[PDB]
Structures are given as structure tokens and as C-alpha cells.
């Protein structure tokens, strides 16, 4: 069951190293984006395409997701989200790199690892990660989505607004 | 059972990316080391301390393993192995980084992951990796060892066994 370990290693070996510093860096940044003319969500957003298809470049993949800026120090990028050519949201967005690992396996013959299997481990990966995140010492949402009526910018824009509702409320 | 996935990811995500190129790079190098004057084993050697203790610097750890050179995104280092202050062998030596992951877990409270567990997953990691390596498309040995024994000697052991197998078959 490879997903169990990929999840842990991604957390222990990556997430728990950037996320502490995260919301500071974003806060530090956000001053100027205010002055220059918007805000950047405080959570890191992670794309979990259950297809395990990670583009080498996210912006070219979805038209409505333009690159905007690199966040100052670990390499993180601020994307703007679009509606009608209008800036509609802005966050730090990333792909869960361990999917690349599940995808390479399903193209590795001696692995005997099928797409059947890969989708299964993908969901498992997503599940187990979420649990890890639950007990961890909130600046980090998981966005699992099965490519089909579906705009990726919209799924992201959805969470994005839900984040701002929770802030002004609680 | 975290070891199953760590193993695979280490292979798919690291090993199978450097090992193809490996033995060329070493061969390319080895000409000069001849002229300058020894040889460098053709396999990449991977340290699996079952304690999961990866020093930030290997040479400082064992006195008998001195750094010698970087081999020309992939960062690899040639070490010389010592006996009596004499150069006794020379290879590219590395620590299996996924152990660091097993060790961090056993110090992460909400993991509930014990040294009991860690040693278990370590061996498992070593086992499963070896199997992966078995069916893979030979420039790469695993050196699992439980600290109690002179590291350099365990490495020197394999090192010579490698040169035996070459001149024979
Ligand atoms: N966006 C992003 N994601 C990151 C970054 N660092 C790690 N990750 C993610 O973390 C996973 C596990 O990392 P690991 O614990 O360091 O565990 C690593 C490590 O043990 C080994 N490894 C990978 N690259 C190197 C390398 O260049 N040198 C050495 N010595 N080992 C490496 O491969 C293991 C797992 O392979 P991966 O497939 O790469 O899987 C990685 C990858 O999905 C990063 O800087 N940015």
C-alpha cells in the first residue's frame, strides 16, 4: 500500500518544513499586494489531481490560472485566479508531487501497478494526508478533484472564498 | 507499513534517475584517477544504518572514510576508504535518505511511531528496496548494518568482492 508512506514522507519531509514559516512570509508579502491591489490567502493550497497528471507548468494547463509572483524565502509561486479576465482570487498553489511517483509506477512494467491501482492509491494518499494534517500543529488545504462541466480555477476559487468567510466570522 | 512507499519513491524518484547515467560518469572520471593513481568502484554504494542515523557529514563520523572528490542536479561524492592511514579503496558512497524520514517519525508524537516500529520499518525498507533493485534494468549495492564494527571495513569488504566478480565474470 504505497500511499501510506508517500503521504508521511511528503509531510515529514516537505510540508512540515515550509508550513511553519508559511503564513508569516505571506503576511510579510501581503502588505504590498494591498498597496499594489489585493490580498493573498493565508493557506497553502495543494492540488491533488487523482489522475496523477502534474503539468510541468500549471498556468498553461488552466487558462484561468495565471502566474503572478514568486513568494520570497524552497520554491513557492503566487497564482491569480480568473473569472472573465478579471482577477478573482490569489493564493499560493502547488501540486502534490508524490502523485508523479504514483504515475511513474503505473508506467513501470516490473511494478505491475495499474491505473486501477493508481487511482486507488491516489485517493488513499489524499485520505491519509488529510488525517496527518488534522493532528498536526491550518495554513494548508487539500484540493482533490477528478478531471471529467469542471473548471479547476472554480474549484480553487470556491475554497478560496470559503476561507475568507471563516476568517471574518470565526 | 510506511516502508513499502518510501522504498518505491526513493527508487522511482531518485535511484532510477541517477543510476542510468552513473557508471559512465565514473568511467569518464576514472581515467584521471588512474593517471592521478587508483580506481573508483563502478557501483553506487548506499549506506542503510538501521539506527536511521544519517550524519550531516559522513567523513567526520567514521575517521577512516575521508572525502576525496565530487563526481562531475545530482550531487555525488567520492570517498576514500582507509586502512592504517593508507588508501584502501574508493567509491561513491551515500546514505539512504529515507531513513531520515523514519527517524523524524519516531520523534513525532502524533505519529505514535516507536523505535520498536522504526527498526522494523527500516529492515522492511531495506528488504523491499533490494527486491525493487533485483528486477530493475548492478551499479548499486545496499549496505545495511546495525551499529553495535568498523564501517569502513564493511564497505571495504563489498568493495573487494566487487573487484573479484569483475575479473572472474
Ligand atoms: N514541491 C516540492 N516537493 C518536494 C520537495 N522536496 C521533497 N518534496 C516531496 O517530498 C517527497 C519526499 O521527500 P523526501 O522525504 O526528502 O525523500 C526523498 C529523498 O529521500 C530522495 N531524494 C530525492 N531527491 C534527492 C536528491 O537530489 N538527493 C538525494 N541524496 N536524495 C534525494 O527521494 C525521496 C523521495 O522522493 P520524491 O519523489 O522527490 O518525493 C518527495 C517529493 O514529493 C521540494 O523541495 N519541493
Swiss-Prot record, chain A:
PTM characteristics: Phosphorylation by TBK1 leads to activation and production of IFN-beta. The phosphorylated pLxIS motif constitutes an IRF3-binding motif, leading to recruitment of the transcription factor IRF3 to induce type-I interferons and other cytokines. The phosphorylated pLxIS motif facilitates SENP2 recruitment during late phase of viral infection. Phosphorylated on tyrosine residues upon MHC-II aggregation.
Impact of changing residue 74 to A on the protein?
Abolished cGAMP-binding
Q: Where does 2',3'-cGAMP bind?
A: 9, 14, 97
Q: Which residues form a coiled coil?
A: none
| Covalent cross-link Glycyl lysine isopeptide (Lys-Gly) (interchain with G-Cter in SUMO), where | 165
Localization: Endoplasmic reticulum membrane; Cytoplasm, Perinuclear region; Endoplasmic reticulum-Golgi intermediate compartment membrane; Golgi apparatus membrane
What spans does the record annotate as topological domain Cytoplasmic, numbered to this chain? Answer: 1-170
The residues that the entry says bind 3',3'-c-di-GMP are: 9, 14, 97
In its UniProt record, a GO molecular function of this protein is:
signaling adaptor activity
Free-text comment on this protein's domains from its UniProt entry: In absence of cGAMP, the transmembrane and cytoplasmic regions interact to form an integrated, domain-swapped dimeric assembly. In absence of cyclic nucleotide (c-di-GMP or cGAMP), the protein is autoinhibited by an intramolecular interaction between the cyclic dinucleotide-binding domain (CBD) and the C-terminal tail (CTT). Following cGAMP-binding, the cyclic dinucleotide-binding domain (CBD) is closed, leading to a 180 degrees rotation of the CBD domain relative to the transmembrane domain.
Q: How does it assemble?
A: Homotetramer; in presence of cyclic nucleotide (c-di-GMP or cGAMP), forms tetramers and higher-order oligomers through side-by-side packing. Interacts (when phosphorylated) with IRF3; following activation and phosphorylation on the pLxIS motif by TBK1, recruits IRF3. Interacts with RIGI, MAVS and SSR2. Interacts with RNF5 and TRIM56. Interacts with TBK1; when homodimer, leading to subsequent production of IFN-beta. (Microbial infection) Interacts with human papillomavirus (HPV) protein E7.
**This protein's name:** Stimulator of interferon genes protein
Organism lineage: Eukaryota, Metazoa, Chordata, Craniata, Vertebrata
Q: Which gene encodes it?
A: STING1
Q: What is the covered span of the full protein?
A: 154 to 343 of 379
Amino acid at each position: 500500500n504505497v500511499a501510506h508512506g508517500l503521504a508521511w514522507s511528503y509531510y515529514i519531509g516537505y510540508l512540515r518544513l515550509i508550513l511553519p514559516e508559511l503564513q508569516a512570509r505571506i503576511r510579510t508579502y501581503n502588505q504590498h499586494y494591498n498597496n499594489l491591489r489585493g490580498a493573498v490567502s493565508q493557506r497553502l493550497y495543494i492540488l491533488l489531481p487523482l489522475d496523477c497528471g502534474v503539468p510541468d507548468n500549471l498556468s498553461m494547463a488552466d487558462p484561468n490560472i495565471r502566474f503572478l509572483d514568486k513568494l520570497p524565502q524552497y520554491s513557492n509561486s503566487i497564482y491569480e485566479l480568473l473569472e472573465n479576465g478579471q482577477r478573482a482570487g490569489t493564493c499560493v498553489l502547488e501540486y502534490a508531487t508524490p502523485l508523479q511517483t504514483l504515475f511513474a509506477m503505473s508506467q513501470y512494467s516490473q511494478a505491475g501497478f495499474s491505473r486501477e491501482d493508481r487511482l486507488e492509491q491516489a485517493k488513499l494518499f489524499c485520505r491519509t494526508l488529510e488525517d496527518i494534517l488534522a493532528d498536526a500543529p491550518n495554513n494548508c488545504r487539500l484540493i482533490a478533484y477528478q478531471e471529467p462541466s469542471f473548471s479547476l480555477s472554480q474549484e480553487v476559487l470556491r475554497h478560496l472564498r470559503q476561507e475568507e468567510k471563516e476568517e471574518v466570522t470565526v
